[PDB]
Amino acid sequence: ELPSLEDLKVQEVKVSSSVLKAAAHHYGAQCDKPNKEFMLCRWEEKDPRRCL
Amino acid sequence: XXXXXXXXXXXXXXXXXXXXXXXXXXGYSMFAVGIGALLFGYWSMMKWNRERRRLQIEDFEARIALMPL
């Protein structure tokens, strides 16, 4: 099947608490270029292994 | 003198009379309030539904804005 590496992507990942992310909708406006390119990669190529 | 039961007249109680009478509502007057409450009802209700649209789009925006989720 060929799985991803044990080291994994992104060191120290994700925020500590939820709802905090939902409270701020300003994440849509600021920093969208890295978000949309990941989104464009994922719909064209459905594999998570390719666009990690 | 011998005393017995005495008679009393005055007004004679007034026997057999219709005490029932129509009050408040007449017919045409209550329908003006009835449809009037409906016209006020729908107009005030839909203003909150339009105010809900301000929230509706903004609530679903949170999922679109958050892609690391």
The two tokens of residue A30 are: 């600021």
What is the C-alpha separation between B24 and B21, in angstroms, rounded?
Answer: 10
Q: What angle do CA B32, B35, B38 make, to 5 degrees?
A: 140
Q: Which residue in the set A14, A25, A38 is minimally distant from B65, CB to CB?
A: A25
Q: How far is CA B23 from the centre of its chain?
A: 16
In chain A, which among 2-41 make CB contacts under 8 A with chain B? 14, 21-22, 25, 27-28, 35, 38-39
Q: Do B67 and A22 touch (CB under 8 A)?
A: no
| Helix (H), strand (E), coil (C) string for A3-17 | CCCCCCCCCCCCCCC
Question: To one decimal place, what's the resolution in Å?
Answer: 4.3
CB proximity list for B67: less than 8 A, separation 6 or greater: A35, A38, A39
* Shortest CA distance from B57: residue in chain A: A25
Q: Do A21 and B58 touch (CB under 8 A)?
A: no
Query: From which experimental method does this structure derive?
Result: cryo-EM
